[PDB]
């Protein structure tokens, strides 16, 4: 039990998505927004 | 936590430019052009591992045909004859024998002709 031998539980710390960081990521370019239209836009989307 | 990109960016560009050695003009000097050249070289290399197998078999066949016809039989009859004789020597080896051991090649032809007889 030292400050460099403590680990989180398995499955407790999932890494966040990072969009727009290249092809291999699977979220490159359009960042999961698809192509064009209102929902692709910054601030884009219709009200509830 | 500001991150400067220069050290990593340099290493990535240099990796590509090292693979573009020998290419003409901007293709060995300029990252944007070298990157495209290296990708295309990789695409061709992938394709040509398949093509190499086709080109060598084509070469072996042409040589077997020449050697068979020097011994009085066509390639197509020679191969049929070997199959009927249960000879399993492949075309790489037959073409090698055709160049390096003409007496042995002649013996294969006589075996093929006997199976067709």
């Amino acid at each position: 039990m030292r400050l460099n031998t403590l680990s989180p539980a398995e499955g407790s710390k999932k890494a966040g998505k990072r969009l727009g960081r290249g092809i291999g990521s699977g979220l490159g370019k359009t960042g999961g927004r698809g192509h064009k239209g209102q929902k692709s836009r910054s601030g884009g989307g219709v009200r509830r | 936590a500001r991150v400067k990109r220069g050290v990593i960016a340099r290493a990535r560009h240099k990796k590509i430019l090292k693979q573009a050695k020998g290419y003409y003009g901007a293709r060995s000097r300029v990252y944007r052009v070298a990157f495209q050249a290296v990708i295309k070289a990789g695409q061709y290399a992938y394709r040509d591992r398949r093509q190499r197998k086709r080109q060598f078999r084509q070469l072996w066949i042409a040589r077997i045909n020449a050697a068979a016809r020097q011994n009085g039989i066509s390639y197509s009859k020679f191969i049929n004859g070997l199959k009927k004789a249960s000879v399993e020597i492949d075309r790489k080896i037959l073409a090698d024998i055709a160049v390096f051991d003409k007496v042995a090649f002649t013996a294969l032809v006589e075996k093929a002709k006997a199976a067709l007889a």
Partner: protein
């Protein structure tokens, strides 16, 4: 081991003499093209000229079937606008008979530097005499 390749320095090329008299143009030309390329040798290598030197005699007596003697047309363009020129087979035989065989063989050889090098080994003559006694050509019946 790697597959054998012929080496331009070590390739042996023999000399042959063929008589075109009465031979069908295209059926002669395929055998010439085959042997100029070296397709008849086990050492055949696509990037190497492994073929033989071939003298063709009596090019003016080469035969063609059907109505080709009058109706086969050779076209060429001079590069000048409107400069499309033509000659019938019979006109070609009368004026430049060696060209009939040379044209036929050239079209059956590979295109590119090596194909042009292969063509240089063909020596076509209109009559029954050549000047290559020194090369000691063997008779070849095509």
């Amino acid at each position: 081991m790697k597959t054998f390749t012929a080496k331009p320095e070590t390739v042996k090329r023999d000399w042959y003499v063929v008589d075109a008299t009465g031979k069908t143009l295209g059926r002669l030309a395929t055998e010439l093209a085959r042997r100029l390329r070296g397709k008849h040798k086990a050492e055949y290598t696509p990037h190497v000229d492994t073929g033989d030197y071939i003298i063709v005699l009596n090019a003016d007596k080469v035969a063609v079937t059907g109505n080709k003697r009058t109706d086969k047309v050779y076209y060429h363009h001079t590069g000048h606008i409107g400069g499309i020129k033509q000659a019938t087979f019979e006109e070609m035989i009368a004026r430049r008979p060696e060209r009939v065989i040379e044209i036929a063989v050239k079209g059956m050889l590979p295109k590119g530097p090596l194909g042009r090098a292969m063509f240089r080994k063909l020596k076509v003559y209109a009559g029954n005499e050549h000047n290559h006694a020194a090369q000691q050509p063997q008779v070849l019946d095509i």
